[PDB]
Each structure stands twice: as structure tokens, then as C-alpha cells.
Amino acid sequence: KKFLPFQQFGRDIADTTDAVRDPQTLEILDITPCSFGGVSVITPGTNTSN
Amino acid sequence: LVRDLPQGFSALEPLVDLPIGINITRFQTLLALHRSYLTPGDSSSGWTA
Ligand SMILES: *[C@@H]1O[C@H](CO)[C@@H](O)[C@H](O)[C@H]1NC(C)=O
């Protein structure tokens, strides 16, 4: 992505900032949420096996 | 070849933010005088009328 000289932050569809400009260096880097997901557990039946 | 404001869309990027902190009610435009105020020419001394 390319930021106009007045632009600092970035956004998508919500309040959370999708991309961001570092104060120390003009380079811009995008942010993605740290991995999440539902741990579903499979089993063949405690009666049958553990 | 458009005398008046053209038909179209152009977005105005921000230029500058001055912390002047003053009160503003009226404004005027500064112009460049190419001709001479002491001696005004009959015509063409200025910029094409
Ligand atoms: C497991 O199920 C079988 C029937 O399919 C039954 O005979 C057995 O007693 C059960 N074992 C336990 C530990 O529940």
C-alpha cells in the first residue's frame, strides 16, 4: 500500500487499524490479528478407546 | 478549452495545518501588477484584459 504524505493510519470495515506508519521511519506495514480458531476435539468413544 | 469550472471530480489532498490560533472573518486576494500604476497603458500593458 502507498500512503499519501499526510496519511498515517489505515482502516478496513471496523475501528481496528488494518495498516500503520511507523513514527521512526516513513515505511508503512500492515497488521493482521494473531492466529485464532476453535479447537474442536475428535474421539472414537471413551468406551471404545482413549 | 473550459472557461468556467470543469465537469469532473478531483480530490483535494491536505496541504498544511498552521497553528495560527487567530480569529478570521474576512479575506482578500493578492494580485500581481505587471503594468505600471504611475503610467497606465491604453491596452495590452496588463495580461490580456
Ligand atoms: C462399553 O460398551 C459396551 C457395549 O457396547 C459394554 O458392554 C461395556 O460394558 C462398556 N464399557 C464401559 C467401561 O462402559
Ligand SMILES: *[C@@H]1O[C@H](CO)[C@@H](O)[C@H](O)[C@H]1NC(C)=O
Ligand atoms: C471574531 O471577531 C468577531 C468580530 O469581527 C467576533 O464577533 C467573534 O466573536 C470573534 N471570534 C473569536 C473566536 O474571537
